[PDB]
Amino acid sequence: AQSVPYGVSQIKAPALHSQGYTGSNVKVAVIDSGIDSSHPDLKVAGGASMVPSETPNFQDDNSHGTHVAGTVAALNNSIGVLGVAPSSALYAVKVLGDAGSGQYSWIINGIEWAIANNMDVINMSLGGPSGSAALKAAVDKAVASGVVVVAAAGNEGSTGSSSTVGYPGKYPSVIAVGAVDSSNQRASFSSVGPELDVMAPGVSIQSTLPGNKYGAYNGTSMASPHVAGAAALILSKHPNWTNTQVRSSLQNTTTKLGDSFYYGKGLINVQAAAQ
């Protein structure tokens, strides 16, 4: 029937959930490649595409769009699983190409559109080994206005001690998510860096998949979605709170996991950060 995903209880959205807050009047933009709107677990509120050749923003070939948009917010009924901002207003913003189309200029005008309709929560479960002057220009802008910009830190590992968190995650106005498992070990593929902010549910995180389906993925970019929603709902309770009031209540309440550079602050606790 309907199933609670191991990472959702493990941070504790459902403490906030049975408290009544699910992020009804919150919006998370899911900055990926799509979001099937005929998926029985998803209610998408709207969005757009920033990909030139891909009309529908509600066409996801690459499958990750939908996958991600499900730790964030699958159903509330008797089918599939259980999202973690299960009540958000969710904005399908497309900037990825099928196959994996990487145009940085797609990425930026994506934050944009996001700025322009008042997004409260921003989620980018992408990034790369090179940056760009603009990227981190905008990146500043969304938080400036008052958006909380949340990304995947990235899926490298070590390479000695320098740092494999990628862009826009490395740029400090962002909350970069490292993956842990249910035993709060950091996943061998989770990037390491100074610039690593918190740790989250990234291994075998099962979510929504097109054609009446669901499935599971290992990703610094499956954790990144837990993280974004704790925040919704943080906001749902303290909807008056600043974009910064919020980062703060997030950095300083996790669960400590292990040295800062594999783990960051450790594990994000929705119930501690919420109140």
Side-chain angles (χ1 to χ4, degrees):
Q2 152 171 57
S3 300
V4 180
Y6 100 70
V8 182
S9 180
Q10 174 179 342
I11 67 166
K12 291 164 278 83
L16 283 67
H17 282 171
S18 78
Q19 175 142 332
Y21 326 104
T22 56
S24 304
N25 278 64
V26 167
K27 312 173 180 186
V28 191
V30 174
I31 301 178
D32 212 71
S33 50
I35 317 184
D36 180 17
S37 303
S38 62
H39 195 321
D41 297 329
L42 295 170
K43 176 96 176 176
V44 177
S49 202
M50 316 299 125
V51 174
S53 63
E54 291 261 87
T55 278
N57 186 16
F58 293 127
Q59 307 282 6
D60 172 338
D61 291 306
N62 282 52
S63 175
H64 194 248
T66 291
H67 198 282
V68 184
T71 292
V72 197
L75 322 49
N76 244 116
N77 11 249
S78 54
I79 60 166
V81 285
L82 184 65
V84 162
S87 21
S88 62
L90 189 74
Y91 289 81
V93 180
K94 183 172 244 175
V95 298
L96 292 168
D98 183 17
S101 305
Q103 184 121 328
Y104 269 37
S105 51
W106 315 320
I107 295 181
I108 297 201
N109 309 246
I111 291 194
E112 302 276 59
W113 186 94
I115 306 183
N117 321 264
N118 307 262
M119 284 301 118
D120 298 266
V121 175
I122 281 163
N123 202 88
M124 273 174 282
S125 317
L126 47 93
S130 117
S132 179
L135 196 47
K136 179 199 194 264
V139 165
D140 282 353
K141 291 193 176 184
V143 197
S145 285
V147 162
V148 170
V149 183
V150 186
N155 289 335
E156 326 313 303
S158 1
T159 191
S161 292
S162 172
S163 186
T164 62
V165 153
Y167 295 81
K170 187 173 202 79
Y171 309 119
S173 68
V174 178
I175 308 148
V177 193
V180 288
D181 66 20
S182 46
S183 303
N184 308 273
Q185 309 287 318
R186 154 201 166 270
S188 320
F189 62 69
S190 174
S191 300
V192 305
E195 305 156 328
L196 171 54
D197 292 322
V198 305
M199 310 283 291
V203 168
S204 301
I205 284 322
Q206 154 104 350
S207 181
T208 51
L209 282 174
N212 175 22
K213 290 187 192 172
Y214 303 98
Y217 280 139
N218 308 307
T220 189
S221 56
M222 278 83 252
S224 186
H226 282 80
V227 167
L233 298 53
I234 273 183
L235 248 5
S236 13
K237 192 172 172 158
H238 300 112
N240 45 49
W241 277 17
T242 2
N243 126 108
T244 287
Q245 208 162 335
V246 193
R247 151 152 247 190
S248 306
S249 183
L250 251 347
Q251 322 263 197
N252 337 359
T253 252
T254 42
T255 308
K256 300 187 187 178
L257 297 191
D259 176 297
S260 302
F261 194 87
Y262 287 85
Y263 291 94
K265 278 323 177 176
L267 188 73
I268 91 100
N269 175 354
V270 215
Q271 177 150 215
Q275 259 226 300

PDB file of all heavy atoms in Angstrom, residues 11-21 76 269-271:
ATOM      1  N   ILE A  11      15.446  11.134  10.232  1.00  0.00           N
ATOM      2  CA  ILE A  11      15.839  12.490  10.575  1.00  0.00           C
ATOM      3  C   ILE A  11      14.644  13.020  11.514  1.00  0.00           C
ATOM      4  O   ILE A  11      14.768  13.862  12.507  1.00  0.00           O
ATOM      5  CB  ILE A  11      15.959  13.357   9.281  1.00  0.00           C
ATOM      6  CG1 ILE A  11      14.633  13.650   8.504  1.00  0.00           C
ATOM      7  CG2 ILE A  11      17.073  12.554   8.584  1.00  0.00           C
ATOM      8  CD1 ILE A  11      14.639  14.701   7.461  1.00  0.00           C
ATOM      9  N   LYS A  12      13.458  12.594  11.087  1.00  0.00           N
ATOM     10  CA  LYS A  12      12.238  13.058  11.903  1.00  0.00           C
ATOM     11  C   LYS A  12      11.390  14.234  11.375  1.00  0.00           C
ATOM     12  O   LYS A  12      11.092  15.290  12.178  1.00  0.00           O
ATOM     13  CB  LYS A  12      12.572  13.380  13.371  1.00  0.00           C
ATOM     14  CG  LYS A  12      12.922  12.141  14.196  1.00  0.00           C
ATOM     15  CD  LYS A  12      13.648  12.559  15.533  1.00  0.00           C
ATOM     16  CE  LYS A  12      15.178  12.806  15.254  1.00  0.00           C
ATOM     17  NZ  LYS A  12      15.363  14.164  14.744  1.00  0.00           N
ATOM     18  N   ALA A  13      11.117  14.262  10.116  1.00  0.00           N
ATOM     19  CA  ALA A  13       9.972  15.089   9.589  1.00  0.00           C
ATOM     20  C   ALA A  13       8.560  14.800  10.191  1.00  0.00           C
ATOM     21  O   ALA A  13       7.618  15.628  10.272  1.00  0.00           O
ATOM     22  CB  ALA A  13       9.891  14.982   8.119  1.00  0.00           C
ATOM     23  N   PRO A  14       8.447  13.495  10.496  1.00  0.00           N
ATOM     24  CA  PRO A  14       7.131  12.953  10.969  1.00  0.00           C
ATOM     25  C   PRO A  14       6.840  13.404  12.496  1.00  0.00           C
ATOM     26  O   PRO A  14       5.733  13.314  13.013  1.00  0.00           O
ATOM     27  CB  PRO A  14       7.145  11.538  10.656  1.00  0.00           C
ATOM     28  CG  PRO A  14       8.586  11.145  10.326  1.00  0.00           C
ATOM     29  CD  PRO A  14       9.289  12.407   9.923  1.00  0.00           C
ATOM     30  N   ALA A  15       7.998  13.911  13.130  1.00  0.00           N
ATOM     31  CA  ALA A  15       7.789  14.635  14.415  1.00  0.00           C
ATOM     32  C   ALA A  15       7.044  15.925  14.050  1.00  0.00           C
ATOM     33  O   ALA A  15       6.120  16.368  14.817  1.00  0.00           O
ATOM     34  CB  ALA A  15       9.251  14.970  14.915  1.00  0.00           C
ATOM     35  N   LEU A  16       7.534  16.593  13.029  1.00  0.00           N
ATOM     36  CA  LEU A  16       6.842  17.866  12.580  1.00  0.00           C
ATOM     37  C   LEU A  16       5.530  17.633  11.915  1.00  0.00           C
ATOM     38  O   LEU A  16       4.528  18.482  11.834  1.00  0.00           O
ATOM     39  CB  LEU A  16       7.886  18.724  11.753  1.00  0.00           C
ATOM     40  CG  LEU A  16       8.949  19.484  12.516  1.00  0.00           C
ATOM     41  CD1 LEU A  16       9.866  18.508  13.169  1.00  0.00           C
ATOM     42  CD2 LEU A  16       9.691  20.368  11.493  1.00  0.00           C
ATOM     43  N   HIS A  17       5.470  16.394  11.280  1.00  0.00           N
ATOM     44  CA  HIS A  17       4.296  16.042  10.487  1.00  0.00           C
ATOM     45  C   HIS A  17       3.046  15.846  11.414  1.00  0.00           C
ATOM     46  O   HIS A  17       1.845  16.464  11.252  1.00  0.00           O
ATOM     47  CB  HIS A  17       4.584  14.766   9.720  1.00  0.00           C
ATOM     48  CG  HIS A  17       5.474  15.009   8.436  1.00  0.00           C
ATOM     49  ND1 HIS A  17       5.962  13.964   7.750  1.00  0.00           N
ATOM     50  CD2 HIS A  17       5.963  16.196   7.792  1.00  0.00           C
ATOM     51  CE1 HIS A  17       6.737  14.391   6.717  1.00  0.00           C
ATOM     52  NE2 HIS A  17       6.691  15.746   6.662  1.00  0.00           N
ATOM     53  N   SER A  18       3.240  15.027  12.537  1.00  0.00           N
ATOM     54  CA  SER A  18       2.154  14.777  13.458  1.00  0.00           C
ATOM     55  C   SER A  18       2.037  15.995  14.465  1.00  0.00           C
ATOM     56  O   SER A  18       1.151  15.977  15.467  1.00  0.00           O
ATOM     57  CB  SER A  18       2.557  13.521  14.200  1.00  0.00           C
ATOM     58  OG  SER A  18       3.562  13.702  15.281  1.00  0.00           O
ATOM     59  N   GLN A  19       2.678  17.053  14.182  1.00  0.00           N
ATOM     60  CA  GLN A  19       2.666  18.239  15.022  1.00  0.00           C
ATOM     61  C   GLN A  19       1.646  19.102  14.207  1.00  0.00           C
ATOM     62  O   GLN A  19       0.988  20.205  14.653  1.00  0.00           O
ATOM     63  CB  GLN A  19       4.054  18.750  15.200  1.00  0.00           C
ATOM     64  CG  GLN A  19       4.139  20.054  15.958  1.00  0.00           C
ATOM     65  CD  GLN A  19       5.361  20.164  16.950  1.00  0.00           C
ATOM     66  OE1 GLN A  19       5.802  19.048  17.449  1.00  0.00           O
ATOM     67  NE2 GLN A  19       5.875  21.332  17.286  1.00  0.00           N
ATOM     68  N   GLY A  20       1.458  18.657  12.855  1.00  0.00           N
ATOM     69  CA  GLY A  20       0.525  19.417  11.995  1.00  0.00           C
ATOM     70  C   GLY A  20       1.164  20.188  10.808  1.00  0.00           C
ATOM     71  O   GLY A  20       0.500  20.491   9.728  1.00  0.00           O
ATOM     72  N   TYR A  21       2.464  20.431  10.984  1.00  0.00           N
ATOM     73  CA  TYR A  21       3.216  21.164   9.876  1.00  0.00           C
ATOM     74  C   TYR A  21       3.847  20.225   8.780  1.00  0.00           C
ATOM     75  O   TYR A  21       4.698  19.274   9.026  1.00  0.00           O
ATOM     76  CB  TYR A  21       4.297  21.994  10.518  1.00  0.00           C
ATOM     77  CG  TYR A  21       3.730  22.536  11.972  1.00  0.00           C
ATOM     78  CD1 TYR A  21       4.176  21.932  13.093  1.00  0.00           C
ATOM     79  CD2 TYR A  21       2.929  23.616  11.972  1.00  0.00           C
ATOM     80  CE1 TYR A  21       3.715  22.441  14.380  1.00  0.00           C
ATOM     81  CE2 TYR A  21       2.467  24.126  13.259  1.00  0.00           C
ATOM     82  CZ  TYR A  21       2.860  23.538  14.464  1.00  0.00           C
ATOM     83  OH  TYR A  21       2.452  24.031  15.668  1.00  0.00           O
ATOM     84  N   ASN A  76       0.112  11.494   0.092  1.00  0.00           N
ATOM     85  CA  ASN A  76      -0.665  11.585   1.502  1.00  0.00           C
ATOM     86  C   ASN A  76      -2.010  10.836   1.277  1.00  0.00           C
ATOM     87  O   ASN A  76      -2.935  11.363   1.188  1.00  0.00           O
ATOM     88  CB  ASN A  76      -0.639  12.909   2.098  1.00  0.00           C
ATOM     89  CG  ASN A  76       0.615  12.996   4.315  1.00  0.00           C
ATOM     90  OD1 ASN A  76      11.425  18.323  10.593  1.00  0.00           O
ATOM     91  ND2 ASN A  76      -0.137  13.152   5.848  1.00  0.00           N
ATOM     92  N   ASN A 269      18.326  17.538  12.118  1.00  0.00           N
ATOM     93  CA  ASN A 269      17.172  17.089  12.915  1.00  0.00           C
ATOM     94  C   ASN A 269      16.025  18.061  12.718  1.00  0.00           C
ATOM     95  O   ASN A 269      16.172  19.197  13.307  1.00  0.00           O
ATOM     96  CB  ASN A 269      17.572  16.868  14.412  1.00  0.00           C
ATOM     97  CG  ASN A 269      16.331  16.521  15.254  1.00  0.00           C
ATOM     98  OD1 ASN A 269      15.225  16.514  14.914  1.00  0.00           O
ATOM     99  ND2 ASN A 269      16.638  16.035  16.503  1.00  0.00           N
ATOM    100  N   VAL A 270      15.041  17.720  12.042  1.00  0.00           N
ATOM    101  CA  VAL A 270      13.851  18.558  11.843  1.00  0.00           C
ATOM    102  C   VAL A 270      13.181  18.987  13.134  1.00  0.00           C
ATOM    103  O   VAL A 270      12.569  20.078  13.252  1.00  0.00           O
ATOM    104  CB  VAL A 270      12.860  17.851  10.875  1.00  0.00           C
ATOM    105  CG1 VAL A 270      12.101  18.778   9.972  1.00  0.00           C
ATOM    106  CG2 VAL A 270      13.468  16.618  10.182  1.00  0.00           C
ATOM    107  N   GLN A 271      13.271  18.054  14.095  1.00  0.00           N
ATOM    108  CA  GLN A 271      12.557  18.348  15.385  1.00  0.00           C
ATOM    109  C   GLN A 271      13.394  19.330  16.321  1.00  0.00           C
ATOM    110  O   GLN A 271      12.769  20.347  16.806  1.00  0.00           O
ATOM    111  CB  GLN A 271      12.457  17.034  16.179  1.00  0.00           C
ATOM    112  CG  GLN A 271      11.864  17.140  17.463  1.00  0.00           C
ATOM    113  CD  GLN A 271      11.107  15.894  17.949  1.00  0.00           C
ATOM    114  OE1 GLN A 271      10.017  16.020  18.673  1.00  0.00           O
ATOM    115  NE2 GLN A 271      11.642  14.754  17.791  1.00  0.00           N
TER     116      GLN A 271
END
